[PDB]
């Protein structure tokens, strides 16, 4: 109902103004118009929410770091729980946008792998803050989203593909950071890297830097791991 070109224009204005809450709101209304998103719009939605949840991820770490060092700790904890509530609201908004629109609309394997990686990413962020029974189900949903995206990417995507390479990076970090398997991480990362360099010559110029950057960060995570 609202003109989508206007929402995308203001989303870019919001991005430049560092008003990411506004930027997410614009891209949420675009997505909720039911049509499948262009690569630009999809990238705008991804940056917006990545920044909105990024702010709460960092604030949570700070306050949770304070909570570990009887009335002071009770104030930190209450605040920490306020930040988690916002973090779970943002993640749920995104996960629900993926379930209702983005994943069901994904015409091609490139799109489908992107959105299923996004679902792994936002369950991963929930996992960083979740506890108990809630958490186990959360961690499980993340591994499933990533794992299915991988299989679609092995089958339908040139290892060249940046979307496929970004998926391998975050899945390997999910293994490393969330599941404490350093050996499942480097293996994943090692494999996806050299699958792509073997076919580095086929890479198109509109995708060369995007792929090679991720490939570098694959190696970068390796060195630290």
């Amino acid at each position: 109902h609202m003109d989508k070109n206007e929402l995308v224009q203001k989303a870019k204005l919001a991005e430049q103004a560092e008003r990411y809450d506004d930027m997410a709101a614009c891209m949420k209304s675009v997505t909720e118009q039911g049509a499948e998103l262009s690569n630009e719009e999809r990238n705008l939605l991804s940056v917006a929410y990545k920044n909105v949840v990024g702010a709460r991820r960092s604030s949570w770490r700070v306050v949770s770091s304070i909570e570990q060092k009887e009335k002071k700790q009770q104030m930190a904890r209450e605040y920490r729980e306020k930040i988690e509530t916002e973090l779970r609201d943002i993640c749920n908004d995104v996960l629900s946008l993926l379930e209702k629109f983005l994943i069901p609309n994904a015409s091609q394997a490139e799109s489908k792998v992107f959105y299923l990686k996004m679902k792994g990413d936002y369950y991963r962020y929930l996992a960083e803050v979740a506890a108990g029974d809630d958490k186990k189900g959360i961690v499980d949903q993340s591994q499933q989203a990533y794992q299915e995206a991988f299989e679609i990417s092995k089958k339908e995507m040139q290892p060249t593909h940046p979307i496929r390479l970004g998926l391998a990076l975050n899945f390997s970090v999910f293994y490393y950071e969330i599941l404490n398997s350093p050996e499942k991480a480097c293996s994943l990362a090692k494999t996806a890297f050299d699958e792509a360099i073997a076919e580095l010559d086929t890479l198109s110029e509109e995708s060369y830097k995007d792929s090679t950057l991720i490939m570098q960060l694959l190696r970068d995570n390796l060195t630290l791991w």
């Binding site: 999809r42 992107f114 990076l169 975050n170 970090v173 490393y176 991720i214 995570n221 630290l224």
Partner: peptide, 7 residues
């Protein structure tokens, strides 16, 4: 670790 910085 370093997750993907831009989509």
């Amino acid at each position: 670790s370093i997750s993907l910085p831009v989509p």
